[PDB]
Amino acid sequence: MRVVIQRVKGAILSVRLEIISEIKNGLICFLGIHKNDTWEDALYIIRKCLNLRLWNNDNKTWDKNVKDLNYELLIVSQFTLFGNTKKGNKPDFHLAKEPNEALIFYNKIIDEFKKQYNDDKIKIGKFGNYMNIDVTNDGPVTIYIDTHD
Amino acid sequence: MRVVIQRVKGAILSVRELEIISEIKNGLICFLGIHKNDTWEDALYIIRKCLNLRLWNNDNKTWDKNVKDLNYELLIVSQFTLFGNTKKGNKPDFHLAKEPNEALIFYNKIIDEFKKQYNDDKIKIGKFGNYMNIDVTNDGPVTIYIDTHDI
Numbered sequence: 001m002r003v004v005i006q007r008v009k010g011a012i013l014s015v016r017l018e019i020i021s022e023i024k025n026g027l028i029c030f031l032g033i034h035k036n037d038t039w040e041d042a043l044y045i046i047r048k049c050l051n052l053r054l055w056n057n058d059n060k061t062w063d064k065n066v067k068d069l070n071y072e073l074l075i076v077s078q079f080t081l082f083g084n085t086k087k088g089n090k091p092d093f094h095l096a097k098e099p100n101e102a103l104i105f106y107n108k109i110i111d112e113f114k115k116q117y118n119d120d121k122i123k124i125g126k127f128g129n130y131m132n133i134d135v136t137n138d139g140p141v142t143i144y145i146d147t148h149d
Numbered sequence: 150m151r152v153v154i155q156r157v158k159g160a161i162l163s164v165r166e167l168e169i170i171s172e173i174k175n176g177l178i179c180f181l182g183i184h185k186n187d188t189w190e191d192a193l194y195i196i197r198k199c200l201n202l203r204l205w206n207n208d209n210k211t212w213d214k215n216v217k218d219l220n221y222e223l224l225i226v227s228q229f230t231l232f233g234n235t236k237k238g239n240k241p242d243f244h245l246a247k248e249p250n251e252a253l254i255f256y257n258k259i260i261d262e263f264k265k266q267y268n269d270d271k272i273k274i275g276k277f278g279n280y281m282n283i284d285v286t287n288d289g290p291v292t293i294y295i296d297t298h299d300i
């Protein structure tokens with residue numbers, strides 16, 4: 001699976017527009033799910049999101065993680081991360097997991113995020129819906145991981 | 150070269166008490182990571198796709214219009230953390246990222262080219278190397294990732 005991790009002062013997530021999720025300091029994680037992903041692919045993303053040391057702990061750089069500072073996570077599902085753009089300019093999403101299967105996988109991932117950290121600290125979107133996210137990027141600090149490495 | 154493209158209704162960049170230096174309305178924010186062994190052909194591929202990827206709908210059609218077609222803007226923000234290696238451990242390390250003194254030369258070259266291949270007034274930038282705060286209204290959201298070393 002693929003993940004783009006961005007570090008935020010906060011994020012406001014809204015749908016067609018009414019705010020339906022919000023977080024202060026922490027991480028927005030765009031989570032694309034490859035169609036051949038295993039529950040081991042999930043665990044790698046979760047371990048990494050919860051544990052990656054992305055904050056300066058005053059005086060020592062790259063030291064504290066989301067759990068350490070008691071920060072929040074917003075997980076947004078982004079199938080467009082499997083938009084192959086090597087052919088034309090029309091991205092093709094043929095590696096992406098099928099929407100239904102994907103929702104079931106996405107959910108489990110969220111359960112586990114809650115099981116691994118804290119369930120008040122994990123926010124979400126409306127899986128396959130138009131969303132509008134005001135993100136305050138801190139740094140900014142972008143982190144990419146394709147677990148197929 | 151590594152890039153994360155995000156579709157935006159707008160974007161507001163501020164550097165250090167915060168001061169606003171850059172704004173775009175509708176268009177693309179582009180977190181651009183520059184590999185140690187990047188050549189100019191790597192850069193052109195980045196510049197091309199950002200300008201030419203059809204990330205917007207139009208009438209019937211989906212994935213049909215690119216940033217230029219709509220007279221939209223780009224905000225290009227260098228982001229070495231894209232080469233933050235996370236295979237080993239929970240501390241990121243950036244050994245694969247290019248050296249700051251040259252990255253800066255490469256990034257400007259790139260910015261010029263971004264203007265040359267579109268329009269001078271449609272390309273906003275960050276403040277290379279410096280700490281930045283960026284408000285992004287993500288439209289979709291739509292996230293695209295390209296690693297040129299896959300080509």
Ligand SMILES: NC(=[NH2+])NCCC[C@@H](N)C(=O)O
Nearest residue numbers: 129130131206211212289290
């Ligand atoms: N899908 C979504 N909610 N947001 C992204 C825009 C996708 C659009 N090309 C489409 O309508 O297919």
